[PDB]
Design a protein around this nucleic acid. Structure first.
Lengths: 108, 97, 94, 81, 96, 81, 108, 94
DNA sequence: TGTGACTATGTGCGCATGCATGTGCATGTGTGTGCATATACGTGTGTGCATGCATGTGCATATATGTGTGCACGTGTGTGTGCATGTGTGTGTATGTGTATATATTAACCTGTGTGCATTGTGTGCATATATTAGCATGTGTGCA
DNA sequence: TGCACACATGCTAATATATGCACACAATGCACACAGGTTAATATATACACATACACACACATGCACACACACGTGCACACATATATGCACATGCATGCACACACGTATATGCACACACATGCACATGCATGCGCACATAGTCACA
């Protein structure tokens, strides 16, 4: 045989193409799975993970932290309009809420 | 003696509790509440420690989101104090009735 | 036994966008929860798309349509580009 | 385990309202909030226990709660699912 | 000449339209609106007659349910007249 | 098709929808707000329906495409297949 | 061999047990489908159909109508507490709404 | 071609509860949509239940649990009784 | 309306903790390889059907007029709620233990699949006749002055 | 109390929609035969419940008064009800393109089975960012001049 190359490396991805293919096969989604379907899905999952991690890392850097905690993920998701829509019915544990006081409640 | 005017320290608590992420209900009384409610479904029920924590995290998130909606109803009625009818309206609009 | 998760892949992505930033175990669990959630949504929508069209296989075309249905405006456009680029690069190298 | 709903104390409900941005609270909120939380917990726990029966287990796991929450449109992250 | 008090004919119209089931928006103007909105996604699209009917059934059901929620918000503010802020509050609480 | 067809949703038509919703009195600014809300709702449904149509490689939007789009948004509709 | 009789008659049902099995098998739900699963599902579908139809037939009789129309189905569902919960996010075409006027709007 | 629907089976159910009551074509379409919607909800919940428990078979036990999760309280109790009775009669007869 | 006193949040500074991170076993899973199989796809086909047009009535829409009354504004008052204080008690943390139990292994067997054949039920396409819908006088029935 | 307006009611024709029927056919059932998923019994490690202990921070109750909510009253213009002219939606047909669906041959691609490495997860330290607490600056609050 030739040297075994992972499909993720072939597609230039960090997420596991082979695992996604197996999960699609055993997830009872269809009786057949195309060759490019796990590659496309793994790339999309990797892109979305990078979007959140980049925003959460910026939030962690703002609070003078070197480690991302659930609070930074919550700040990243809720301050991003498109991520907030995607995760609008999702609760993040230990994430808290966004600081928001209605202007009518502020003293005059 | 020094006395803060009404609503001054209430606003301080809003800023304090919107900055933090810890659970606001005491863990032990909430665990007793969870087990009491589960008695009506089964007897001799055991709970994983993370199962009760998951329930508390969802319960507090649900209540905080409800209070945000309740606050908007009170402000809509030109008030600053939430009332039971504000909660009832928010749940009715949400479909939780 | 072995409990598979996405933690090691999420960590690799984190080092790409933030080489000096770590992640907590609780935050890693949330990221693992997020990946499984999005996977189930896309795969579920793609599964229904094949059923609506009387198809028995899920292909990259079904994944592309599911991504557009499930993702908001700019997220869908960029995710489609990453998925198309990976598929194009994949078949170029078998 | 009798009358544990009063364990959700007045200061606990006030803290939850503060995180929600509430500045002033009427005295009748606390009993109304306890009834709301009681209804919410019954719905989640009933589904979580139902998942436990199907698995033929006697221990409610974190995944059972997560699946119960997901079924109600209240997906929770950070507990294995 | 005979003249009804303000709100008397409105109450009769509420009873009249809460009893019937027909579509309350004119069909042809609604069809033109659907085609104009669809032209922003694809050019030279065609619609089945029942496809527009399904859109109108869902659109009117969505608007009627929104007005029901909007009416509750107006009454909550001790009013009987619905206002744009009533609609905005109802959509905010719904999650829209 | 045409342009500026949102005005085709006339004030009497909006009033009839409010009557079915049990609304007694309507402010004059409601009609412009209602038109914006309807356009946003239709844009979301039609965009998904066309996406279903595009995937099927069709040029005609069918009732099923609208039904699937409505189901996708949590607004399942009975009576069209 | 013997004279073929449907599984619906074996289970004492009117809904098609054999068709539900095929819909389960080809619906991509699991690798295998048990023998009792389509029977159980068909009986539940038949019971729910009977519950709505008997309530809708009462609404038609209340209106001096012999034919069930979408209005009668909507009246049956919305006037039943449990069926309204089951179909809470469901829109019935040409069903209308329940007659309901807030008491504050009634004349003084 | 042939289009499959539940119309004939809904009609037989109607003739038992209301022997002298008909149904309109629009109302029959709604009933067909209702049966398909409930079928997909139950089958989808049963499918997830099998995956959660590392099972590959949908059995009547998965269907019964899915009914309890999806139907409201008293509706679920009668539906479970109907399903159990049919499976018992089906097994007793074959 | 600026100004002092009082309080509480924030900012470094110093220090221990435990928790994240890097390092190896190893094993289970993804991979490379042919192999056979069936789905999907391109081609052509005929037909429904959606689009556009042209015509007609008459229903609904738009405009204007008058006016009632609901909205909003301001006023005042009682009391409910917030703030702060003192006290104790129930929570949080650590510790340990016995027990129930969730988990994994192994054998076997029953149940579901697969295959082919017989065939009966189901959907399509047509008759057929019922209920539904459209008028016209009557019959209350409510509103309104 | 009487008048005017609107919805309803027994009433008759008309029709289009539902109901029933006959026929092919595709899907269901029947009968094997196979095999693997599931069950069951066992053992094992897990982690949950139970008890015990402590210290202390939070919860509870009280007293005080501030200001918010609720009622009240005022006025005004906004919106309802009405009438009138009219635009146009609805229905109705007629014609034609044209797209959709069926049907079919068939190659491309996916599953299958198997050997085999290697990537991933569990376990193992390890050190380092977070938490904890002290002091100190610092923005903010609230009478008071």
């Amino acid at each position: 045989r030739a040297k075994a190359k992972t499909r993720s490396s072939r597609a230039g991805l960090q997420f596991p193409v082979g695992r996604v293919h197996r999960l699609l096969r055993k997830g009872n989604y269809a009786e057949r799975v195309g060759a490019g379907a796990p590659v496309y899905l793994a790339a999309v999952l990797e892109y979305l993970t990078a979007e959140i991690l980049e925003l959460a890392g910026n939030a962690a850097r703002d609070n003078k932290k070197t480690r991302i905690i659930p609070r930074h993920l919550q700040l990243a998701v809720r301050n991003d309009e498109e991520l907030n829509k995607l995760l609008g019915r999702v609760t993040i544990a230990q994430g808290g809420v966004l600081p928001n006081i209605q202007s009518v409640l502020l003293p005059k | 003696p020094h006395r803060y005017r009404p609503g001054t320290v209430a606003l301080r608590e809003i800023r304090r509790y919107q900055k933090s992420t810890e659970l606001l209900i005491r863990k032990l009384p909430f665990q007793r509440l969870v087990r009491e409610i589960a008695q009506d479904f089964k007897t001799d029920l055991r709970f994983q420690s993370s199962a009760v924590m998951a329930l508390q995290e969802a319960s507090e998130a649900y209540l905080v989101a409800l209070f945000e909606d309740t606050n908007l109803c009170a402000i809509h009625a030109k008030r600053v104090t939430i009332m039971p009818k504000d909660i009832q309206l928010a749940r009715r609009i949400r479909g939780e009735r | 036994t072995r409990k598979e998760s996405y933690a090691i892949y999420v960590y690799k992505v984190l080092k790409q966008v933030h080489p000096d930033t770590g992640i907590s175990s609780k935050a890693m669990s949330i990221m693992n929860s997020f990946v499984n959630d999005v996977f189930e949504r896309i795969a579920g929508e793609a599964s229904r798309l094949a059923h609506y069209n009387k198809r028995s296989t899920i292909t990259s075309r079904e994944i592309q349509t599911a991504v557009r249905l499930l993702l908001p405006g700019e997220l869908a456009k960029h995710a489609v580009s990453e998925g198309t680029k990976a598929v194009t690069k994949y078949t170029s190298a078998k | 385990l009798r009358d544990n709903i009063q364990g959700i104390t007045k200061p606990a409900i006030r803290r939850l309202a503060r995180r929600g941005g509430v500045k002033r609270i009427s005295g009748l909120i606390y009993e109304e909030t306890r009834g709301v939380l009681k209804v919410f917990l019954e719905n989640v726990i009933r589904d979580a226990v139902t998942y436990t029966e199907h698995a033929k287990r006697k221990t409610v796991t974190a995944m059972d709660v997560v699946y119960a929450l997901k079924r109600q449109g209240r997906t929770l992250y950070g507990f294995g699912g």
